[PDB]
């Protein structure tokens with residue numbers, strides 16, 4: 001085992017094959033501990049989960065400071081935090097996976113290159129290298145800064161995202177809201193009038209597929 005795993009890929013290689021809560025260490029630094037949920041079963045495992053929607057119990061209509069820091073129960077609905085995402089994606093080349101499920105249908109999207117910039121970029125999204133079944137809805141968002149109601153797409157749709165004008169992906173939108181563009185949307189899978197029951201966003205090193 002690696003003593004200070006920097007992501008769920010180094011925790012899985014450490015023999016942690018059960019999905020659940022693990023400690024990672026940003027930059028391998030024992031003073032930068034972070035408790036994350038690791039999805040150890042989806043497409044070979046080793047994924048830090050950073051967004052989960054599943055039941056509408058958590059409020060995602062939150063401010064800049066909340067999106068920067070993270071909120072929620074990492075075992076249920078939560079957001080990991082943009083500062084966390086910036087610090088993880090800085091450690092190497094990461095891949096994004098999005099898992100969607102709605103009324104028994106499933107879809108996914110993988111992006112070979114995923115990064116989140118620092119606060120001076122307003123946590124700029126980079127997403128490149130799509131494959132999947134959900135349809136490439138993140139392309140629309142590529143290169144955009146993060147927006148919250150207090151930093152208006154976030155206000156109009158009562159969510160938070162790397163909004164443009166405004167979204168094809170709205171996974172931090174209002175749970176169970178089928179009104180146009182209000183809900184948990186992945187446009188190129190289920191459009192803007194269908195809120196998705198289950199959604200996860202997760203990341204691991206792009207080179208994990210052959211490490």
Ligand SMILES: Cc1nnc(N2CCCCC2)s1
Pocket residue numbers: 043108110131
């Ligand atoms: C079901 C699936 N979940 N993930 C999949 N892929 C990820 C790697 C590229 C294509 C396969 S197929």
